[PDB]
Amino acid sequence: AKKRPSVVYLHNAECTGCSESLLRTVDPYVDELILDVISMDYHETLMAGAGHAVEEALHEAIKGDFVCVIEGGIPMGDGGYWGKVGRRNMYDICAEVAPKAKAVIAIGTCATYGGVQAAKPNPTGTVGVNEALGKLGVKAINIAGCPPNPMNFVGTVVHLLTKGMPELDKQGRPVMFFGETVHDNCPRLKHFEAGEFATSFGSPEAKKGYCLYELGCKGPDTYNNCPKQLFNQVNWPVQAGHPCIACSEPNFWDLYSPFYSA
Amino acid sequence: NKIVVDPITRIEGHLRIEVEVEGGKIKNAWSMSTLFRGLEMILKGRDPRDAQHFTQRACGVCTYVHALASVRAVDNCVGVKIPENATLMRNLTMGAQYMHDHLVHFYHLHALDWVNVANALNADPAKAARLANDLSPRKTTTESLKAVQAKVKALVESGQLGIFTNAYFLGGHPAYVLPAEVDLIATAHYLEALRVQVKAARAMAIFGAKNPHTQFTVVGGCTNYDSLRPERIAEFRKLYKEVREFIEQVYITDLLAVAGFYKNWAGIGKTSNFLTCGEFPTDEYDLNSRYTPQGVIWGNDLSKVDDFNPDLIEEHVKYSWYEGADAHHPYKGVTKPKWTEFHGEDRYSWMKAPRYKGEAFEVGPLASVLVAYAKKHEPTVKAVDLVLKTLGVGPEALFSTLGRTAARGIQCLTAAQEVEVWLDKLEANVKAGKDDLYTDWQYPTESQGVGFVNAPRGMLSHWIVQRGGKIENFQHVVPSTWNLGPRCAERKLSAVEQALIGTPIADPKRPVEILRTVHSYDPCIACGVH
Numbered sequence A: 001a002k003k004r005p006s007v008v009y010l011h012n013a014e015c016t017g018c019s020e021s022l023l024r025t026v027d028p029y030v031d032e033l034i035l036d037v038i039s040m041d042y043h044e045t046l047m048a049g050a051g052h053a054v055e056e057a058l059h060e061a062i063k064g065d066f067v068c069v070i071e072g073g074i075p076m077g078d079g080g081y082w083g084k085v086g087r088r089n090m091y092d093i094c095a096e097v098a099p100k101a102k103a104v105i106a107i108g109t110c111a112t113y114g115g116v117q118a119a120k121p122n123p124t125g126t127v128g129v130n131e132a133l134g135k136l137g138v139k140a141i142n143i144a145g146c147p148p149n150p151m152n153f154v155g156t157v158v159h160l161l162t163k164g165m166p167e168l169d170k171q172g173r174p175v176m177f178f179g180e181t182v183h184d185n186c187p188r189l190k191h192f193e194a195g196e197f198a199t200s201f202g203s204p205e206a207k208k209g210y211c212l213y214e215l216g217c218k219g220p221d222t223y224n225n226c227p228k229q230l231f232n233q234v235n236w237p238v239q240a241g242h243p244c245i246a247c248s249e250p251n252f253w254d255l256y257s258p259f260y261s262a
Numbered sequence B: 001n002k003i004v005v006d007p008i009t010r011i012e013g014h015l016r017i018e019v020e021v022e023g024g025k026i027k028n029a030w031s032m033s034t035l036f037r038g039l040e041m042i043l044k045g046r047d048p049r050d051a052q053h054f055t056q057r058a059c060g061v062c063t064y065v066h067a068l069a070s071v072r073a074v075d076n077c078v079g080v081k082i083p084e085n086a087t088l089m090r091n092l093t094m095g096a097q098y099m100h101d102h103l104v105h106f107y108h109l110h111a112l113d114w115v116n117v118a119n120a121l122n123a124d125p126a127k128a129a130r131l132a133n134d135l136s137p138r139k140t141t142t143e144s145l146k147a148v149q150a151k152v153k154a155l156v157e158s159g160q161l162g163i164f165t166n167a168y169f170l171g172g173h174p175a176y177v178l179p180a181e182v183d184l185i186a187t188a189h190y191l192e193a194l195r196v197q198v199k200a201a202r203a204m205a206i207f208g209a210k211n212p213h214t215q216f217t218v219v220g221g222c223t224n225y226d227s228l229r230p231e232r233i234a235e236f237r238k239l240y241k242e243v244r245e246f247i248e249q250v251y252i253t254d255l256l257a258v259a260g261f262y263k264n265w266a267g268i269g270k271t272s273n274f275l276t277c278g279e280f281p282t283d284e285y286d287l288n289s290r291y292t293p294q295g296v297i298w299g300n301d302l303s304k305v306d307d308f309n310p311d312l313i314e315e316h317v318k319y320s321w322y323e324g325a326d327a328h329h330p331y332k333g334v335t336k337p338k339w340t341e342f343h344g345e346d347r348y349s350w351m352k353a354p355r356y357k358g359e360a361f362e363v364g365p366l367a368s369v370l371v372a373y374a375k376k377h378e379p380t381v382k383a384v385d386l387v388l389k390t391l392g393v394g395p396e397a398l399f400s401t402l403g404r405t406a407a408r409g410i411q412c413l414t415a416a417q418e419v420e421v422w423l424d425k426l427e428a429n430v431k432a433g434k435d436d437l438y439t440d441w442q443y444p445t446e447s448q449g450v451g452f453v454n455a456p457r458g459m460l461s462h463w464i465v466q467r468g469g470k471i472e473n474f475q476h477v478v479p480s481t482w483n484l485g486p487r488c489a490e491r492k493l494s495a496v497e498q499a500l501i502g503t504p505i506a507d508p509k510r511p512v513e514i515l516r517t518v519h520s521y522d523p524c525i526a527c528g529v530h
């Protein structure tokens, strides 16, 4: 035992968008990271053992100084029996672990706000991380977006063990990344202000880069950094002439939809 | 006499597999899909234009694919004819999903059931290293492997093995049978393929908007106009190429080497009944217009092969946590959960049980590479013909967990190749001065729609019944729902269930075999259960 900071990665009612998106870090590569940087003490997608052997792992793991990473949001449901691992409910595994970490960090709009599963009627009645582990004194830092963009995560944890508890916004999101809206930093701004919009995807305007307000774009009411860091170091939704759907706002699914209007 | 191994670690989703043993052999397997969200429920009464977004969130390992079957399903209830340019983008992108998905599934999710990271610390660099070049038309310098070794040496020196912590090959396991040299070769790649995987995704971002979870498709299909610049049609190819070299000079070789030292596995994995819808359509209303042939294979007879008919496919419950026991074909399916606690009312899984005709059927690449094979698709054979040889087996050896596993390298080949044509084709018309993406459409008073995607794990199909531009029913059956997932009313076991049976296990306390068969089927429970 020693080396780098123990990290416990928990997978609740997720879809693995957030874990996959993580493997996409650059600068801090996943190898550098998972090796010379952090110490992924528990992570069900990459663990070499299975079942029992890993349960033992977590157990020992959550004994030290560790950072919890919770992907997903919890089915508190009509019991909370919608998600079970090792035969135990996802709430329970969470009530156990979260509370013991120097710091917890909820990844993706599911962990954070409640995600896809939590959309009407929310049959599983799933809710966000620190809206469930709150009563247990958990105050997680939200790395929003469906999924969040490597650096927002990585940069966030780096910030932890380096400087400290990052300044956060109203929705518990690091201001150092979710400060500005999407619109604020979008290129088709020009057209927004000038009044030049596309009225259809297959149209001269659309093809020449007209703003998407019309088509449904939600950059206006969405705080993210996409326009400026951008995905896979090569693109973004709008750059691909597709409306922004507010994938990092507390209730996009049911709020900012229909996603092809307003 | 049951062994239980919940969770199934290196997969996607929450899978619990319970096995019963009778003197070294599995005697009863159970596939217990353990979490539920219920998107089909969430979807009720929304604009079918939205759908493609929700469902895409079925999962993220197999990103985009649920987008596709969704664009495609409305396009179908609307009856749009998307600019073949759009057809090009969409199949272009799917192609990378294959490249990425599979690259990262052998190494990063399947390897460790074979490789003995530990073992490697022995291995003579100069030795393993000299082995390399013999196996790959790529010069692997002693320095390389020699590094890898120290990089892992420093994994013991740290006190923390993190990922490897309670590893099944720790202190050697009888079932790990690899020359320390080979492990040092495997591992060295494992670690590289962690780098490539970025690129395989960087390129998919190009058309795709961002990786993971895609944003560039629409009913009327595609919106990414910018990706048409040659300036950008170049940037893809260059990635495309390098990801292809890796896959060819490296993923393909290793599957082969390892598959070598594990030839006994070619005799285990009991499956019959395969089917596919085909993928990479050239005309969107013809399954027969697809690059990879659509076909059905009953039992193991690679000589029949009849047509895929989506009329006789109805999910089941009975041993699923949903009300009642009666079955329904998608277009008329229901989704209201039960939950009886575990084996309650005999129910064990959140996944419905999609029975084909009446029979279980195993979808995915095996089924794919069998269907192709049984139908001249040249590149497919040329591919197996060599495997089957390098190995030195026959067709029936393909029917095993070694088959199932092997086939997946080939599928990723009989796709990595093709991608070459589509990009070109696209770059042609662009040069022409044809940039048609998107077609104008309108909602019929009411209509039905169905879109078939042959996802990296198989036959995906979304199915919409819309009334006035609002969803009246948008149910979906996903690959893993076929492969993993309960028994039917006719209690017929499932692809994997049967695959587990008879599997010998050398050490219950560390059952690598349970995992070698379950991982060969690339289980994706988030999809499966949706």
Ligand code: SF4
Pocket (backbone or CB within 6 Å): A014, A015, A016, A017, A018, A071, A072, A107, A108, A109, A110, A111, A115, A116, A145, A146, A147, A148, B057, B059, B060, B213
């Ligand atoms: S936040 Fe989005 S990408 Fe992340 S697990 Fe949830 S649905 Fe998937």
Ligand code: SF4
Pocket (backbone or CB within 6 Å): A182, A183, A184, A186, A187, A188, A189, A190, A192, A211, A212, A213, A217, A218, A219, A220, A238, A244
């Ligand atoms: S495309 Fe969207 S985010 Fe960009 S300027 Fe227009 S409305 Fe704002």
Ligand code: F3S
Pocket (backbone or CB within 6 Å): A145, A146, A182, A222, A224, A226, A227, A236, A237, A238, A243, A244, A245, A246, A247, A248
């Ligand atoms: S859709 Fe989400 S990924 Fe960024 S461009 Fe808009 S906040």
Ligand code: NI
Pocket (backbone or CB within 6 Å): B012, B058, B059, B060, B061, B062, B063, B524, B527
């Ligand atoms: Ni998936």
